[PDB]
C-alpha cells in the first residue's frame, strides 16, 4: 500500500487524519509499527487504548456521525517515529480486511549527533582463506544520512565496497557498515587504506594498515 | 501473562508449501481469536486472516485461494500453510491474538450492529525468503581490537536471513551492536556485532562470540583476542 | 427501465435489498437530451422483469402524482358544522353504544376537533372514553362487521425511521422537478414503533373484559394477527411526518386469555412505501416525496379495529 | 450552451404556454362595484 508522509517538531502534538473516511458508526483501530518490528495497538475501540500506553495516545470516539477518526500524538519524541495504521470497521462497508494507508511519522528537530566510526583489518584467518575484508561500522550518527569513501594510500577506491543503508537504532539514532571486499595481496601490496565518513557537513576518517 | 513465538523455514522453494507455527505461553488457544498478519518490503501490513475461539476460519480474499489456517489445542501451537509461493510472499510472518468487538450502532434485535476484531498481543516475527537459492551457513571471523577499545565479530557470506549473534552466551549485554547485514552481489548476506569494553579488560575477559544461522542449522563460536 | 442494485451490503441477510440503488436515463428540460441520475427507492415500491432490471410498482395499473412538497400531510383537527336553520346533537352519555336512545343529549353549531387521521388497525391520536372501554358493532354477532374499541386510557407509541436521508431535486423537465432519495448519512437503519409492554397488556385486558360482556364470562377470546390481504390492511399502516409506515403487529395480537415485561416495550418492525396507491378507484397513485432527516413522531393509541372469525 | 447551439430561456425553471392569439392583450377599462348594501 501507499505510505503518505508527515512531520511533526520535537515535542508538538500531532494530528494523524485517517484514510478512509466512515460511512456510519465506526469501530477504528491504531497501530503503531516500524519496519522489522512487531506492530503496536495503540488504540482499539474509537478511543479505548490497551494498558502500557501513554495518554498522549488519544482517539476520537464516534458520538454524532461525521466527525473524522484522527490519532492524536501529544508531547511527540523522536521515539513516536513509525507507520500508524488506521483499522477502518464501520456499519456501511464490508470487512476490514485492508489495513489501508500508512502514515510515515517524522519527528523533527532533533538533536544532531556525529557518528563513531570504527575500522577493523582484515583477520588473520580471513587471510589464512586467502581472503580479505575491510569493515568500517559506523553508529550514533544523525540525522541517519552518510557517505562512506575509501582510499588505497591516497588514490581512491570504489571497486569492490558495499555499504549498508541507515537503520534506526534502539536509543533512536542511526548506523551503517561499509564492507570493501580486496584480494590479500591487494591488502598488503599497499600501504594503508581510510575510511572517510562524510555526515552533514563534516567528514571523519578512520585508516588502517598491515602493521 | 500472554506472549507469542513464531517459528518457520526461513527459506521456502518457488511454487512450494510453505508452513508456519506460533506457540502461545501462559494462556490457552481454543478460548480466543488468532491471526496471521505479514509485512513484505514496500508493501504495508497485510491481514492474511484469522481463526476463533471455535476453530472457525476466515481467510483474506486477496490469498484465500492458497492459505489454510489451522490449530492444535493439545498445547497452544496453531500453524498456518501457504501453497504456491512466489517471490512477492517473502514476508515477516507476525502472530497476534484477535479479541472480537462488537459494534452496536441501531438494534441487536434488527442486527443493527457488526463485529470487528484486533491484535492486541503480537508475536516478534519469523523472517521467511522465497527464492530458488540454496541455503548456506556463516563464516564466522574475529576482529581484535587494539578511554576503551572494540572488537567485533564477522559473520560473513550466509543465505538467508536472518543471524542471531550473542556475546559470552549471551552474558556480555551491555555496548553491543549489532548492524545490519549487507546483500553481496553474490547474494550472500554479511553481517557484523562489535562490543564496546573497557581496555584493561583485555587481559583476559574472554570474549566469545555466538553467532546462530537457523536456515543452515549451522551455530559456531570464535573467540577474539589482540 | 431501473437499473438497481442494493446499497451498501453487508447488514443482516434479507435487508440489503430492502432498499435500492437504483439509475435510469431521464429526460430534461431539453426533450432531445436525457440524463442517466439514480435514486434511492424501498423494494416495496419496485418489482423486477425476470438480470438487475426493475419498474415502479404502479406503471402496469396506475399513473403516479407526487405530492407538492410544501404541502403537510399533518392532520389539522377539523370542525364540522351544521348551517343555519340545522343542528348538531350530541349524545353525551359516558356509556353510549352508538345506537339506540341516548337519555343525556345537547346540541351545538360546531362539532369538536377532527384530526383526520387516516391509520389502519390501530386508531391513532382519536378521542378516548371517559368509563370503561366501549365496544362498537351494529350487529356484533355478526362476524364480518367490524369491531371499533375505544380506549379510555391511551397507550403511547413511539414510531421512527432512523435513516438521516437526503432529497435530490432532479428536473425532468421545464418547471417540473422530481425530488428523488439523494443517499443516507450515516448509518442504514430499520424504521419501527415502540409502545409499552406494559400499558399494552394491561390495555388489552381490558378490551378483553368488554368482550366478555358479549360473549360470556366463561368463554376464551384469542387475538391473532392479520390473516392476509393488501400491505395497508394487514399491517399498521399510517403518515408518520410525511413517510407512510406499515407496521408489522404481530407482536401486538398474539396473545389467548383464559376465563378468568413491567420494564421494557415490544418493537414492531415497519417497512416503508413511496408509491402509496389509492383507497377507492384503481388507476391512481401518490408518490410521497422523500423526508429529510431522521423522522420520529410519538402519537396516542385511542382504539383498535378488530375482526371477529365466528373459543 | 458552451458553437452556434441555443435553447429558449425559460426551460430551465418554467414551462411555457403561448396564448391563443384569438385574445386580445388590449386593456378595456374596467368598472368594480359594490354589492347590494354595500
Ligand atoms: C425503541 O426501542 C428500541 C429497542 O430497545 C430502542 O433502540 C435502542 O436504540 C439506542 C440508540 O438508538 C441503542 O443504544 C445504543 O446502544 C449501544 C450499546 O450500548 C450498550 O453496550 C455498550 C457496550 O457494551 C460492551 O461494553 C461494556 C463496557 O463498556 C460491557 O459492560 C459490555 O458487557 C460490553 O462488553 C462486552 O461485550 C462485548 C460484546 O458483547 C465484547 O466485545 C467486549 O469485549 C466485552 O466482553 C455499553 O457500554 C452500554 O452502556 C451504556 O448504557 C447503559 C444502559 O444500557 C448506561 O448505564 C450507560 O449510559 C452506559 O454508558 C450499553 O449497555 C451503544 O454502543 C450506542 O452508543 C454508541 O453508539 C452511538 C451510535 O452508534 C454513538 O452515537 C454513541 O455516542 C455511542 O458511541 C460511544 O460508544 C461506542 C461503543 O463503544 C464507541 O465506539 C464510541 O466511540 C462512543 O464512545 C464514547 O462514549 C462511550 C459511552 O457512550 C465512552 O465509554 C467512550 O469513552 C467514548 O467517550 C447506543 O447508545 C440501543 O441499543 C437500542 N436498543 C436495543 C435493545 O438495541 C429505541 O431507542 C427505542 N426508542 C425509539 C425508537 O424512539
Ligand atoms: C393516497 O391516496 C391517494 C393517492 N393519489 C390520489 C390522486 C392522484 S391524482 C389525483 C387527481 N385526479 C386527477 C383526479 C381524480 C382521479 N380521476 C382521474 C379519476 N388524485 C388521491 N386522491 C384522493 C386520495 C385519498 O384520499 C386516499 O385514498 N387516501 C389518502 C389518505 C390515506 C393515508 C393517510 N394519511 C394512508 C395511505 C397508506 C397507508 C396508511 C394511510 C389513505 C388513502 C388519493
Ligand atoms: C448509487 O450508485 C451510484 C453509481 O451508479 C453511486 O454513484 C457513484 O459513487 C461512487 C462512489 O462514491 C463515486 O466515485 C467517487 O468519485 C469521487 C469524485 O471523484 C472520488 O473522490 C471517490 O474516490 C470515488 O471514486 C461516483 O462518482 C458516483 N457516481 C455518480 C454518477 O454519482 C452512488 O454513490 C450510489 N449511492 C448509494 C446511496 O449507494
Ligand atoms: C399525533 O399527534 C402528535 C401531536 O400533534 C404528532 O406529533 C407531531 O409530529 C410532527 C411530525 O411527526 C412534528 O413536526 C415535527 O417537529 C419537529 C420539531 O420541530 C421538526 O424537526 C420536524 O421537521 C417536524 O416539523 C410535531 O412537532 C409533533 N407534535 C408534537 C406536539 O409533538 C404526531 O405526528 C401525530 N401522529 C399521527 C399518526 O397522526
Ligand atoms: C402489475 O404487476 C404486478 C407485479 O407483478 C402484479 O402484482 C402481482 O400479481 C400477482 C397475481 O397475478 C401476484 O401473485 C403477485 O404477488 C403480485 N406482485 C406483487 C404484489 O408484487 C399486478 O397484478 C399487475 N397488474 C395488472 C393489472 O396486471
Ligand atoms: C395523549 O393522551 C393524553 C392523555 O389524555 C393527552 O393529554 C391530555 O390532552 C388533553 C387535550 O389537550 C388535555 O386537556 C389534558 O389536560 C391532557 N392531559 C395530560 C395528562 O397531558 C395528550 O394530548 C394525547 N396526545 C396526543 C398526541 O393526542
Ligand atoms: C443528517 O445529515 C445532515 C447532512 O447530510 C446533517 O446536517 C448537518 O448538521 C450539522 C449540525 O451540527 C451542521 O453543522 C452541518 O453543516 C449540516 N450539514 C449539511 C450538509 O446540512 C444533519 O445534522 C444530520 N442529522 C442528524 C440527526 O444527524
Ligand atoms: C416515547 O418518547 C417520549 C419522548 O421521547 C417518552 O416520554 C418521555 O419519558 C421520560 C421518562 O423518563 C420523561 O422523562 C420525558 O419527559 C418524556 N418526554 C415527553 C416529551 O413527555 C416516552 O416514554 C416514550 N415511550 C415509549 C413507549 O418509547
Ligand atoms: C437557467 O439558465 C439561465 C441562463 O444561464 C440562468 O440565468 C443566469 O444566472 C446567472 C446566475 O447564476 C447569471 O449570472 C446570468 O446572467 C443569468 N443568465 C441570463 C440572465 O441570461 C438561470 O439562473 C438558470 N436557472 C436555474 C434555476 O438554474
Ligand atoms: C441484495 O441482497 C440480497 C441478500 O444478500 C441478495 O439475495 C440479492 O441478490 C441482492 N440484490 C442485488 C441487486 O445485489
Ligand atoms: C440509457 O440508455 C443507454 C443507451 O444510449 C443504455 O446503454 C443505458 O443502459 C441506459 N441506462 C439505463 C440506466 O438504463
Ligand atoms: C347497543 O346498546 C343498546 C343500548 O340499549 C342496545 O339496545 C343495543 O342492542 C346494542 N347493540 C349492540 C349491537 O350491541
Ligand atoms: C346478525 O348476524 C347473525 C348471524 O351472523 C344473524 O342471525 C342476525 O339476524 C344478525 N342480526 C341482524 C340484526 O341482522
Ligand atoms: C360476569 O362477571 C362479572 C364480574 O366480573 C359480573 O359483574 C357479571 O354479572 C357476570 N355476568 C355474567 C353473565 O355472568
Ligand atoms: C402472522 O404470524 C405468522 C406466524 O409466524 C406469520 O407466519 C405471518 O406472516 C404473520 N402475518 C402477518 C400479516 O404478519
Ligand atoms: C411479522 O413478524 C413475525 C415475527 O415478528 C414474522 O413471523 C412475520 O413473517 C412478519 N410478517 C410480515 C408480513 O413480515
Known amino acids: 500500500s501507499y505510505v503518505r508522509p508527515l512531520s511533526v517538531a520535537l515535542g508538538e502534538t500531532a494530528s494523524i487524519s485517517c484514510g478512509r473516511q466512515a460511512l456510519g458508526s465506526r469501530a477504528v483501530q491504531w497501530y503503531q509499527h516500524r519496519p522489522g518490528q512487531a506492530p503496536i495497538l495503540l488504540i482499539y475501540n474509537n478511543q479505548d487504548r490497551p494498558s502500557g500506553i501513554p495518554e498522549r495516545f488519544s482517539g476520537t470516539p464516534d458520538i454524532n456521525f461525521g466527525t473524522r477518526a484522527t490519532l492524536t500524538i501529544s508531547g511527540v519524541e523522536a521515539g513516536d517515529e513509525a507507520d500508524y495504521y488506521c483499522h477502518m470497521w464501520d456499519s456501511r462497508s464490508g470487512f476490514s480486511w485492508s489495513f489501508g494507508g500508512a502514515t510515515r511519522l517524522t519527528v523533527l528537530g532533533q538533536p544532531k549527533a556525529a557518528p563513531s566510526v570504527t575500522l577493523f583489518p582484515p583477520s588473520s584467518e580471513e587471510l589464512q582463506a586467502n581472503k580479505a575484508t575491510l569493515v568500517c561500522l559506523i553508529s550514533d550518527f544523525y540525522p541517519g544520512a552518510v557517505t562512506v569513501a575509501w582510499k588505497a594510500d591516497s588514490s581512491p577506491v570504489k571497486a569492490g565496497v558495499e555499504t549498508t543503508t541507515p537503520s534506526k537504532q534502539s536509543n533512536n539514532k542511526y548506523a551503517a557498515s561499509s564492507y570493501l571486499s580486496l584480494t590479500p595481496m591487494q591488502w598488503k601490496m599497499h600501504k594503508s587504506y581510510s575510511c572517510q565518513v562524510t555526515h552533514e557537513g563534516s567528514t571523519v576518517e578512520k585508516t588502517v594498515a598491515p602493521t | 501473562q500472554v506472549q507469542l513465538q513464531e517459528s518457520g523455514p526461513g527459506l521456502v522453494k518457488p511454487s512450494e508449501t510453505l508452513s508456519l507455527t506460533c506457540t502461545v505461553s501462559?494462556?490457552?488457544?481454543?478460548?480466543?481469536?488468532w491471526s496471521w498478519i505479514r509485512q513484505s518490503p514496500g508493501k504495508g501490513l497485510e491481514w492474511i486472516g484469522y481463526?476463533?475461539?471455535?476453530?472457525?476460519?476466515n481467510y483474506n480474499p486477496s490469498l484465500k485461494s492458497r492459505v489454510i489456517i489451522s490449530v492444535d489445542t493439545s498445547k497452544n501451537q496453531l500453524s498456518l500453510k501457504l501453497n504456491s509461493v512466489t517471490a512477492a510472499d517473502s514476508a515477516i510472518y507476525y502472530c497476534?491474538?484477535?479479541?472480537?468487538?462488537?459494534?452496536?450502532?441501531?438494534?441487536?434485535?434488527?442486527?443493527?450492529?457488526?463485529?470487528?476484531?484486533?491484535?492486541?498481543?503480537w508475536g516478534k516475527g519469523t523472517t521467511v525468503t522465497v527464492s530458488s537459492a540454496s541455503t548456506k551457513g556463516p563464516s564466522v571471523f574475529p576482529l581484535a581490537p587494539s578511554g576503551t577499545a572494540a572488537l567485533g565479530c564477522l559473520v560473513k557470506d550466509y543465505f538467508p536471513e536472518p543471524v542471531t549473534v550473542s556475546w559470552n552466551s549471551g552474558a556480555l549485554t551491555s555496548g553491543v551492536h549489532t548492524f545490519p547485514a549487507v546483500l553481496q552481489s553474490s547474494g550472500l548476506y554479511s553481517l557484523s556485532s562489535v562490543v564496546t569494553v573497557p581496555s584493561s579488560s583485555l587481559g583476559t575477559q574472554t570474549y566469545i562470540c555466538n553467532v546462530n544461522h537457523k536456515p543452515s542449522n549451522t551455530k559456531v563460536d570464535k573467540k577474539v583476542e589482540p | 427501465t431501473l437499473q438497481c442494485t442494493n446499497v451498501t451490503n453487508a447488514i443482516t441477510d434479507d435487508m440489503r435489498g430492502e432498499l435500492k440503488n437504483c439509475s435510469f436515463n431521464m429526460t430534461t428540460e431539453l426533450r432531445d437530451k436525457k440524463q442517466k441520475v439514480y435514486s434511492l427507492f424501498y423494494r416495496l415500491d419496485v418489482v423486477q422483469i425476470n438480470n438487475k432490471e426493475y419498474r415502479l410498482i404502479n406503471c402496469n395499473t396506475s399513473a403516479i402524482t407526487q405530492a407538492c412538497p410544501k404541502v403537510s400531510f399533518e392532520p389539522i383537527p377539523i370542525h364540522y358544522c351544521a348551517p343555519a336553520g340545522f343542528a348538531i346533537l350530541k349524545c353525551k352519555d359516558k356509556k353510549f353504544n352508538g345506537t339506540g336512545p341516548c337519555p343525556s343529549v345537547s346540541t351545538v353549531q360546531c362539532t369538536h376537533g377532527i384530526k383526520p387521521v387516516v391509520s389502519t388497525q390501530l386508531l391513532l391520536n382519536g378521542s378516548l372514553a371517559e368509563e370503561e372501554v366501549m365496544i362498537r358493532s351494529e350487529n356484533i354477532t355478526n362476524n364480518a362487521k367490524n369491531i371499533l374499541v375505544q380506549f379510555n386510557t391511551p397507550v403511547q407509541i413511539n414510531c421512527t425511521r432512523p435513516n438521516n436521508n437526503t432529497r435530490k431535486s432532479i428536473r425532468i423537465g421545464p418547471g417540473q422537478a422530481f425530488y428523488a432519495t439523494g443517499d443516507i448519512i450515516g448509518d442504514i437503519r430499520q424504521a419501527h414503533c415502540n409502545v409499552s409492554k406494559a400499558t399494552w397488556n394491561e390495555t388489552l385486558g381490558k378490551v378483553v373484559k368488554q368482550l366478555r360482556k358479549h360473549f360470556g364470562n366463561n368463554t376464551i377470546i384469542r387475538f391473532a394477527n392479520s390473516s392476509g390481504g393488501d400491505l395497508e390492511v394487514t399491517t399498521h399502516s399510517f403518515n408518520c411526518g410525511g413517510e407512510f409506515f406499515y407496521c408489522n403487529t404481530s407482536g401486538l395480537f398474539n396473545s389467548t386469555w383464559i376465563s378468568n415485561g413491567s420494564n421494557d416495550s415490544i418493537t414492531l418492525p415497519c417497512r416503508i412505501k413511496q408509491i402509496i396507491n389509492m383507497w377507492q378507484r384503481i388507476g391512481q397513485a401518490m408518490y410521497a416525496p422523500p423526508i429529510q432527516g431522521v423522522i420520529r413522531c410519538v402519537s396516542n393509541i385511542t382504539g383498535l379495529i378488530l375482526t371477529r372469525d365466528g373459543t | 450552451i458552451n458553437n452556434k447551439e441555443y435553447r429558449l430561456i425559460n426551460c430551465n425553471t418554467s414551462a411555457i404556454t403561448q396564448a391563443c392569439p384569438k385574445v386580445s392583450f388590449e386593456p378595456i377599462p374596467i368598472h368594480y362595484c359594490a354589492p347590494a348594501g354595500f
Open positions: 497476534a491474538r484477535a479479541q472480537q468487538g462488537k459494534r452496536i450502532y441501531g438494534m441487536v434485535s434488527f442486527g443493527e450492529f457488526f463485529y470487528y476484531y484486533y491484535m492486541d498481543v
Open positions: 501462559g494462556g490457552s488457544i481454543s478460548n480466543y481469536y
Open positions: 481463526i476463533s475461539d471455535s476453530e472457525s476460519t
